[PDB]
Amino acid sequence: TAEPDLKTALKAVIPAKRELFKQVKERSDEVIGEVKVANVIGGMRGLKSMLWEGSVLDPEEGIRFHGKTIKDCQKELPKGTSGTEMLPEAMFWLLLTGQVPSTNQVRAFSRELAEQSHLPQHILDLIKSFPRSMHPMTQLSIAVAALNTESKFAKAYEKGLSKADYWEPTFDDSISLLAKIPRVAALVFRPDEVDQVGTQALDASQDWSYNFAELLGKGGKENQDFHDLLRLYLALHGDHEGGNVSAHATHLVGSALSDPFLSYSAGLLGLAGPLHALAAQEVLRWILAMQDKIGTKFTDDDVRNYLWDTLKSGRVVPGYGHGVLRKPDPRFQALMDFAATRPDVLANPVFQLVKKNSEIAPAVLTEHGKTKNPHPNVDAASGVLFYHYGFQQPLYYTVTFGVSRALGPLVQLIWDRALGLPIERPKSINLLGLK
Amino acid sequence: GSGSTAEPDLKTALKAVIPAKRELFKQVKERSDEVIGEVKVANVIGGMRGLKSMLWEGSVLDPEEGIRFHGKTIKDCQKELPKGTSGTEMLPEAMFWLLLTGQVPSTNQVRAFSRELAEQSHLPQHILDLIKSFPRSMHPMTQLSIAVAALNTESKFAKAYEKGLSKADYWEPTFDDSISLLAKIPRVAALVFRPDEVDQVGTQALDASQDWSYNFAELLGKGGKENQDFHDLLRLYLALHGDHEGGNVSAHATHLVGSALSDPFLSYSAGLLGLAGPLHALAAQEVLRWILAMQDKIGTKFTDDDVRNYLWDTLKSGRVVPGYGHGVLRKPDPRFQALMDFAATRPDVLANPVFQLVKKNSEIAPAVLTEHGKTKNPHPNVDAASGVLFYHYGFQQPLYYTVTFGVSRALGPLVQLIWDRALGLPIERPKSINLLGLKK
């Protein structure tokens, strides 16, 4: 009568994945690609060279999770007891097992996450040692690494553990990290309340995102719309193939058999890189500057003129353009669907500007001709939506992304260990060697 | 000296060689479309093994001569690189100079660089407080990674990037941060080694006229003239382990995180998190345990046959001879030989039975392993000797051998990070696929 818990459901699908892996391994010698000089000097761009199970980017329909579109996930995944949005814990279930959980399975997993959320005293002390001006992503990376004192994998490996069993402690550590990371993030957000936020008991009947909101100081019925935003945000950003730096660094460090705490810490150190991590922040700044210029009662024409002027000036429209995706990011559209049912969001001029830009900017960018596949990505909307709900320190938008992006890389780490994938170790060459 | 021809500092010497590297990069870029290999299913499921897919300037593994630094063998480095004011071994500071610039520094340039490192060796108070928060059982490599990441509060690159900085200038703050990290890391490592003395070791003033290894030894509690042989071992160890191509996890993770424009503190922290992985990090420790177990079994007065018999029994049992074997290198690791050359001038090392056993194994094990036929290129690597040499000098907590490797392995990856920024290399971003996509 009792439904399988997540560990049982994972164990049931391990044999089929190992069988599929065995079939692929028989074709080891088969050639699938070429390596060119471009790939070596160009950061391996386009080189199909690592495994990632849970998500694959479809050039038309965007990111798919085990073949499911964002829309399929929004229809199929269990929701909270209140609210309209899919749960990140349900997305984690799907990523890990390939299967949609029942509502009751999700409720039991949420209860586990709440119960495992507490931090050891040394983590609270560690966090209190950080200077106030330490960058929030540096704080988050360090704290996550420091939780390796609690690693079951590290201890089991040292004691002696069969290869075939490496996945179990990896799974236990991953759930532990997931339970804890929202609380660590909230301590980064509220450095003066370490003692209180660091020990506060979570409501075991509520979902992971709700409890994260509570730790952020945005709990209770008055913040229910924000709860739904946060649920959606965390679900949407959970995984996006293995190539991005946070996913890849997690896998890389993981592949040397560093435990999930150390491995996702490395992921977060990569996420701290300014080059692509600040897109949501940049979009927000750009939208607010546009509002400053064109005011709060603006026409379609005003928007179009503003976009042309930006482009003619040699500036970019942030949050637009992609190497391969030929349509709007379905993650973007999911945020727009969230907004469409909330009259106060639709009344916000900042949001209206995001919406108008999404209707006008792609045609403008195409005609201008400089930007490949000029459609909105998720960063076009996420910052503005957080800003609307009072979360107006953009610097911390990366922290919330770091919480979300634990989901997919941890799933892949579990599978890496289940399948027995080896250390990641490419071969380097010097420029003289390419000449 | 402040003349017309006054000897360049490291940053000036680097600046002088940047234009030629950018020109060589331009020439390589014209060949972008040239095919240099194949990708197979093996490469995707096998952690990219053998896939030539990243750039690393400073070191290239030669199948005959072993690891070379800008074409120079370990023997060339031992002859050409400047030594300490006392001592017979090449300085890791000089190795760093060579890796970075492609050039052998003068003794005077090395002395000035050592002084810069000594002057920057102090830590901010919050780093000492952070280290004091660590539980005593926290793994030493977790401690080291965290403390290095926490030094990003001092990053010039992070602050300059945020303020606005030309792409052509990214290398300068990267260089400044890298030197800062190098100066500080031995002190951080010593705090990991001595958790009861954080306040003292953490603030102790260093002799600014001493070299980087000497100051590290001093912070470890092994300073003074009585430890001069250990100083030379440590110099050699740190110089030898500084760089070994880009593929190893510490080098690669540094480059990967660095490629998203995270500063050198955050990037080498990621390197150290990878170094903390037990799978391939613990070889020096395994060799030490194996040698000591062998000595236990065969004693100190043994025949060549006894050694051979011990090796055959190990192999027939299905166990490995650690510290032996390589995929590509067809001779003893030249790093191994450099450790043996160190030993050859120290009569107390040569008198140590544990060292004699390392030497005897290197003369007997290769033939045995070849005949057994299971281990490719069955020659000793550097791990065959490093742990025993430390053990001889009283550095007998093998768990901490990885920490000393972490200090050494700052050198090469930081150099490559500086070059990545000088060249404007993009984010590392390969493409993934699922098993279903390989089954088709």
Swiss-Prot record, chain B:
Cellular localisation: Mitochondrion matrix
Claim: DNA damage is one of the keywords in the record: no
The protein's annotated pathway: Organic acid metabolism; propanoate degradation
Any one GO biological process: carbohydrate metabolic process
Catalytically driven reaction(s): propanoyl-CoA + oxaloacetate + H2O = (2S,3S)-2-methylcitrate + CoA + H(+); oxaloacetate + acetyl-CoA + H2O = citrate + CoA + H(+)
Induction notes from the record: Expression is induced by peptone and during infection.
Annotated Gene Ontology cellular component terms: mitochondrial matrix
Disruption phenotype: Leads to attenuated virulence in a mouse model for pulmonary infection and an infection model based on embryonated eggs.
Active site: 280, 326, 383
Domain of life according to the entry: Eukaryota
Task of the protein: Component of the methylcitrate cycle that catalyzes the synthesis of (2S,3S)-2-methylcitrate from propionyl-CoA and oxaloacetate. Plays an important role in detoxification of propionyl-CoA, an inhibitor of both primary and secondary metabolism. Also has citrate synthase activity using as substrates acetyl-CoA and oxaloacetate. Plays a key role in the estabishment of invasive pulmonary aspergillosis.
Quaternary structure and interacting proteins, as annotated: Homodimer.
PANTHER family according to UniProt: CITRATE SYNTHASE, CITRATE SYNTHASE 3, MITOCHONDRIAL
Protein's name in the database: 2-methylcitrate synthase, mitochondrial
Organism annotation: Aspergillus fumigatus (strain CBS 144.89 / FGSC A1163 / CEA10)
UniProt lineage: Eukaryota, Fungi, Dikarya, Ascomycota, Pezizomycotina
Gene: mcsA
